[PDB]
Scaffold this motif. Structure first.
Motif, short mmCIF file in Angstrom:
data_model
loop_
_atom_site.label_atom_id
_atom_site.label_comp_id
_atom_site.label_asym_id
_atom_site.label_seq_id
_atom_site.Cartn_x
_atom_site.Cartn_y
_atom_site.Cartn_z
N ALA C 269 -7.35 14.65 -43.91
CA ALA C 269 -6.40 15.76 -43.87
C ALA C 269 -6.31 16.46 -45.23
O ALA C 269 -6.15 15.82 -46.27
N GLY C 270 -6.40 17.80 -45.20
CA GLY C 270 -6.53 18.62 -46.38
C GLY C 270 -7.93 19.15 -46.65
O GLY C 270 -8.08 20.08 -47.44
N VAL C 271 -8.95 18.58 -46.01
CA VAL C 271 -10.35 18.89 -46.31
C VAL C 271 -10.80 20.19 -45.65
O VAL C 271 -10.35 20.52 -44.55
N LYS C 284 -18.35 27.04 -44.89
CA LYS C 284 -17.33 28.04 -44.56
C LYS C 284 -16.56 28.50 -45.79
O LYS C 284 -15.48 29.07 -45.66
N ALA D 7 -6.68 15.32 -50.19
CA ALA D 7 -6.09 16.57 -49.71
C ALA D 7 -6.17 17.68 -50.76
O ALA D 7 -6.64 18.79 -50.47
N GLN D 8 -5.71 17.40 -51.98
CA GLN D 8 -5.90 18.33 -53.09
C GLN D 8 -7.32 18.32 -53.64
O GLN D 8 -7.80 19.36 -54.11
N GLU D 10 -10.51 18.59 -53.59
CA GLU D 10 -11.58 19.57 -53.70
C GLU D 10 -11.12 20.95 -54.16
O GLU D 10 -11.97 21.79 -54.48
N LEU D 11 -9.81 21.21 -54.22
CA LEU D 11 -9.26 22.45 -54.77
C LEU D 11 -9.87 23.71 -54.15
O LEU D 11 -9.83 24.78 -54.75
N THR D 12 -10.43 23.62 -52.94
CA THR D 12 -11.31 24.67 -52.45
C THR D 12 -10.50 25.79 -51.80
O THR D 12 -9.43 25.57 -51.24
N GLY D 13 -11.03 27.01 -51.91
CA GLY D 13 -10.34 28.24 -51.55
C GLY D 13 -10.30 28.64 -50.09
O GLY D 13 -10.09 27.81 -49.20
N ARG D 14 -10.52 29.93 -49.85
CA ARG D 14 -10.30 30.55 -48.55
C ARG D 14 -11.22 29.97 -47.48
O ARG D 14 -12.38 29.64 -47.74
N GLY D 15 -10.69 29.86 -46.28
CA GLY D 15 -11.40 29.27 -45.16
C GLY D 15 -10.42 28.72 -44.14
O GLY D 15 -9.33 29.26 -43.94
N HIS D 16 -10.83 27.62 -43.50
CA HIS D 16 -10.02 26.92 -42.52
C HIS D 16 -9.91 25.46 -42.95
O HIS D 16 -10.92 24.84 -43.27
N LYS D 17 -8.69 24.92 -42.94
CA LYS D 17 -8.45 23.61 -43.52
C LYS D 17 -7.76 22.69 -42.52
O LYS D 17 -6.83 23.09 -41.81
N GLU D 20 -3.47 20.58 -43.24
CA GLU D 20 -3.12 20.65 -44.66
C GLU D 20 -1.63 20.42 -44.90
O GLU D 20 -1.25 19.58 -45.73
#
Ligand SMILES: *[C@@H]1O[C@H](CO)[C@@H](O)[C@H](O)[C@H]1NC(C)=O
Ligand SMILES: *[C@@H]1O[C@H](CO)[C@@H](O)[C@H](O)[C@H]1NC(C)=O
Ligand SMILES: *[C@@H]1O[C@H](CO)[C@@H](O)[C@H](O)[C@H]1NC(C)=O
Lengths: 492, 71, 492, 71, 492, 71
Positions: C269-271, C284, D7-8, D10-17, D20
């Motif tokens: 969760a969070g990925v 993506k 959860a934090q 990868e710090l990764t931006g815009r997309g679908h998560k 979260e």
């Protein structure tokens, strides 16, 4: 001269060379436009309506309840369950009864019980909320030339003209006949705030009620009733009209709270009535900004001959309009057409005209004319129409009239200025500064105290005054001075 | 137009004729909503009254009283 | 237009004389690149994928156990032994059991016992890691002209041109039909940091899960699960799924901890999700830096006559796009081709064409044209298409729009990081220094921070702030500078 | 045995998560439920901390630290 | 002598004029009652069970999802709705999606969207909770005389006696042949707490798991999973195994969070296992207090002749038992019945016997007798049986045994809690005071920090120590020693 | 979402216990593995406390708190 029919008349004046005049028109009001060398016009906003609005919600006013069912369990036999618990359009409640040897259970204790009823809405017991579409509402403006003929409220003036402004409307040219031509333009974007208005309609044929009401969107959305959207099959929150009695052994009872129409109508107080005319849904409170073009208006009969001074006769003697103007009507019996020799003098007869004619270049036509409307300086005057004459005493003092004009300005200023500061024909160098200050002031005084209402506003103002009495240091006293301005604005 | 609430008379305390006795507590949603709608002003009143008053109990009781007087 | 479809489009623009503009084509976004005296383009990145990326290692999520065998010996005898200790691919444990004449030993005391089981993974219960190859990653970038034809998201515009970029591929020239040749360079070396990135498959083609996830190399390599390399026949550390019972008499039980899959799915969760499309493994998220060579695009139809102003009709009236643009479509019944007479007039300046068209030189042609998009200044305007018109109120505010553009800039800098600094163009000092300092500071910070996580951020911030309050010497002020800098950066 | 939350990380931006917001929220729900069961002991320890004062910020720091250390 | 088969033997001893001994029988323990002039008894609580306890709840461990459906509405067409929202066994979610001319709406804005799935528990993936009934749970107490014929744990003694206890029971008289009667009274209401206990079972057929776990009631009631009572058809909170992805324009994805069983099995890790034997649901932890009336026990064989010293031989030579106790078996070949001459003479001290015989008045009979048990003084010994002799060396030490015995008292206090005062209790004022002090301290410590667990209790204890390190007044200094006591109470 | 454990000391008795040893010392492993990731920051953080808290004894309490808060 339609607008003699109507309190909340306003006057507007154009100088020589004045060509285009901004106005704010409003329902239940009128502007008499005048200008040098131009015929006067009465301009008013007739009606604000839309055909077949969309709708937002239906609320139920009186539930029909039926098919009460109950299920119960002994104290350790777990939750009681009903098949109807999952059917649409049912109201249910679950609770605990007391049980014992006396209810054929083994154990004394508390035992689960559940009750459900079918719930429906009574015939013709719905309220429907309609809402406007900004692209389809029609802003109807009418204009009448001052021809010097009088017609009652239940008569139609022969020269009344109409324009129906819309988002597609661009700019309208109205042919006034012999008076030429007027250009007219109105900004529908400047109209009523269509977002915050809902037209609450009750079911048909109530004889002693309004047909519909104009209500605030958030209030209408906060109604404490069962509701559904258009065409939805079943009522949400149907429990709001039902109560359940305390459980007693295997038994529980359902009470219908009955018709809530009375608490609605008693809540619809202080609320502006609306109107319905077949499919056309009308507002009764609103305004629009328009831009009247006096470029092509002209005056009939400037070349006409002077009438015979001797042949006039009063048909309606001079009387007070209640607008500090004198209205009158003369018959005439000579050869026609001709110009009416209207004049007025202050007493002492200096032979200097003091008639402020509102009626342009008064004429007796071959079949009309003879109504006259004047303003006069205070005190004793003598009106003359040829040899026909009448002593008139004009009531108010000049300073009283100046104050009264400022009071009228203030009276309109709350409604119009909250919409727009520039009623006064673009005094722009003053008016834009006033508009900016009033805009930021209204922003503050609405973001604070928003929805608080006048009495709680004033009460909090008094609390702030007591804080003024508690202000320890000068800056704090300045914060009190700000609260003073606030409490003044709320008391005013 | 008004009907006076019977809880002012409450002719017998033994009664059970409605939910309404618990509903009176639900009507505190009027004060709580007034709180929720005006929290920034309340916190303003808090920040004001917590600073302006020296007395410590009034720095609760007065604000409570004012919020209960607010409709 | 494509970019109309997306809540996240950037209106990059260039003056006259501008060429080879620089973009950073974030996935899930769009660019409307408009150039004076040139055709406007929509440009975007549509996919980031690799065909059959190589794989790192596999985990198992549900053990299958079999052939449990046990042996034990009396306390004075010696250690227990099994051949299943050496036959690799088993799980085993040695322990001690209480024995005596209760269990037919000769002497009371604790005697050795051993247990072993065979273990294997349950069918389709594997998980697998894939890693991108920086010389096989593929990018794709699509361009589409503003032809003035609208096309819904489930249709394909006839001018949608696709470029595919591989790092071995030099400048690509795309002929945009009549508008001439655009060109691109999109050097793959500015892509995502592939070294950080593993793709996680779960072996099942589950009907109700994302087909793969994207995860950090560290987390995936850290998992406390039994694992193997591809094509290695047996699992390492299989005991991680097998828990032995406590000894009892001559017996030990073996307990199986069952399917971990729900644990893994919750820990994910969070990925960020990813996608799998047959053989192609799509990311993506990401971006690439494209040089865009505009220098050969040309206007179409500057030499056509105007249309007849009379014949336009609203196929679709002006409406708010949500991008602070006005979007509209007209249909025209006259002879073709002809130029559309678009205008927009501000209320304040009845002679000024305020319309800032995004669409170039809007044209009608035998099978297309008539879709229009424009931008307007806040306040009150009248749009015109020859004789056709529409009142438009542009709801925004200038300072509000600038502030929103600052919010967009802050968002871009947050999501992209340092590459955001060179969005639009090289930008001289401000961009190059901002990039240099942001790279150095962000690298040092990430080196300290990487993996510390949100609540530890808050903790360390509060600790540093408290120390800044507590401690004495002037250097502590710099520690407070660090405390505030971290706290705001992490809270933003 | 344990698997750490990414959860934090990868710090990764815009997309679908995936999932979260509940990841962040559930920690707070843990603290809220622990406090709810504790409240008798929590109020006791609050008054014990009132028996102490280096500063009120120290008091709330210690309380927050304790509530975050326990589940 | 059953108790030799266990680790956790206990001894109880009675003088002459001992009558109703009090015991606390414990499951997995065994008490040797001894008294002067009487046969010794082994006594134990064999098992605790109930037939077909009531099912408290089912929880679901893996949801099947099917029949996904979606409905959506353009931004002003109100809430989208489905007939599935009301039915039983559907999980639904409502949300909003960004919509516009990209997906054939007329307005750009947030459309309404709703989606629903059927959700049903998959196959065997259920956990069932069962609760005991105080009126029906059966406590089985067994008793066995020290007849001196040995038997393995794998074989059933010739004289084992079973009493079954329930609320229907009384002083139960067990007749043990020539060893006389014994009286058991056992307080069913003194047993385990049947409210706090729930048996949790999964799929009993799971090859590599225990059948059930003895979980605590509050934990099982606070489990998060979907749940229902027996016989109910539809799962409450079925959404908790389901999650919906973010809305796309006209779609929401639905995901299954997979098999939770591994999470549950991990969470169990504190728990004592339980057992199921067809219909009989057995506990594996617990105790009962009992009063054993010895008064009618009778010595066998005091009239028999002495055995011939010449004719013994070892069937089993002496050995330690780990109960600091020597056990042996002899054969005999003279005429019989007879009484065995057993003695022990320390060393170098021929006339002082030291044989503390635990098997009283040893005898040999036709197919019976011959097993002997004794306790000896530390150091060198010589054991005799007639002329047969063996040079036993008694390991251990004088103080070591006292220490071991008192340590067992601490273990008893640790595992029994309060009731440890009853064990061996012949009533005494000091014991009553001890029980009063222990009851008040245990009540305080169970209420204060109840369920907090050892690491948080360490936390609170050390916090309480820190809060007392250097303080304004001694007036609450007891708090530090209370913390010390809390630490000690925490430690065990 | 989440299933909590319950305290080991609640029921006890002498029966076999499921995963009897896994309840406690295992929780230290995440801390040590955390150190093995954090190490540069961890020593820095330690030295930050060590240099500031020249008041020796409260170093231990503060660092114990920080380590136990450390996931
Ligand atoms: C107007 O009203 C007056 C008085 O009610 C009446 O005498 C006259 O006939 C009416 N005229 C019309 C056209 O309704
Ligand atoms: C696109 O979707 C619309 C939905 O209204 C449909 O009418 C149209 O046929 C679709 N076209 C294609 C090419 O999928
Ligand atoms: C266990 O007892 C059975 C009879 O009860 C016997 O046949 C068997 O031999 C015993 N086990 C051993 C290992 O001797």
């Amino acid at each position: 001269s339609r607008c003699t029919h109507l309190e909340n008349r306003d006057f507007v004046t154009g100088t020589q060379g004045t060509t285009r005049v901004t106005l704010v028109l409003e329902l239940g009001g009128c502007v008499t436009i005048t200008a040098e060398g131009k015929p006067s016009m009465d301009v008013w906003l007739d009606s604000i309506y839309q055909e077949n609005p969309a709708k937002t919600r239906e609320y139920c006013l009186h539930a029909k309840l039926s098919d009460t069912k109950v299920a119960a369990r002994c104290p350790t036999m777990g939750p009681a369950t009903l098949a109807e618990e999952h059917q649409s359009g049912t109201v249910c409640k679950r609770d605990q009864s007391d049980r014992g040897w006396g209810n054929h259970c083994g154990l004394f204790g508390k035992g689960s019980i559940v009750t459900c009823v079918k719930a429906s809405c009574e015939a013709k017991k719905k309220a429907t909320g309609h809402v406007y579409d900004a692209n389809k509402i029609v802003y109807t403006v009418k204009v009448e030339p001052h021809t010097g003929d009088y017609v009652a409220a239940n008569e139609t003036h022969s020269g009344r003209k109409t324009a129906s402004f819309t988002v597609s409307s661009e700019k309208t040219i109205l042919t006034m006949g012999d008076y030429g031509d007027v250009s007219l333009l109105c900004r529908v974007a400047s109209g009523v705030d269509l977002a915050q208005t809902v037209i609450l309609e009750l079911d048909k044929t109530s004889e002693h009620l309004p047909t519909a009401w104009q209500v605030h969107r958030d209030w209408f959305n906060d109604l404490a009733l069962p509701w559904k959207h258009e065409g939805a099959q079943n009522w949400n929150n149907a429990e709001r009209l039902v109560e359940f009695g305390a459980p007693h052994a295997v038994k529980m009872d359902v009470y219908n709270l009955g018709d809530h129409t009375g608490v609605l109508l008693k809540s619809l107080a202080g609320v502006p009535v609306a109107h319905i005319d077949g499919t056309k849904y009308h507002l009764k409170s609103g305004h629009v900004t328009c831009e009247v073009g006096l470029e092509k208006l002209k005056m009939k009969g400037l070349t006409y001959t002077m009438c015979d001074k001797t042949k006039f006769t009063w048909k309606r003697i001079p009387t007070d309009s209640g607008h500090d103007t004198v209205v009158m009507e003369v018959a005439f019996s000579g050869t026609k057409p001709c110009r009416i020799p209207v004049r007025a003098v202050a007493h002492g007869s200096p032979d200097v005209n003091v008639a402020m004619l509102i009626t342009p270049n008064p004429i007796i036509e071959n079949n009309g004319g003879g109504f006259i409307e004047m303003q006069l300086p205070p005190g004793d005057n003598i009106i003359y129409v040829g040899e026909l004459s009448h002593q008139w005493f004009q009531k108010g003092s000049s300073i009283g009239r100046v104050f009264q004009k400022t009071r009228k300005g203030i009276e309109r200023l709350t409604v119009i200025g909250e919409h727009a500061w520039d009623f006064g024909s673009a005094g722009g160098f003053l008016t834009s500064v006033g508009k900016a200050l009033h805009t930021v002031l209204g922003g503050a005084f609405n973001s604070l105290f928003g929805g608080v209402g006048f009495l709680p506003k004033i009460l909090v103002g008094v609390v702030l005054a007591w804080l003024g009495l508690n202000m320890r240091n000068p800056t704090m006293s300045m914060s009190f001075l700000l609260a003073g301005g606030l409490v003044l604005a709320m008391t005013l | 137009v008004l009907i006076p609430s019977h809880a002012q008379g409450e002719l017998t305390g033994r009664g059970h004729k409605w939910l309404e006795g618990d509903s009176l507590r639900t009507h505190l949603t009027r004060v709580e909503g007034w709180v929720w709608k005006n929290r920034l002003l309340a916190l303003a009143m808090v920040t004001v009254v917590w600073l302006t008053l020296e007395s410590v109990v009034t720095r609760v009781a007065v604000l409570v009283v004012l919020l209960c007087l607010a409709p």
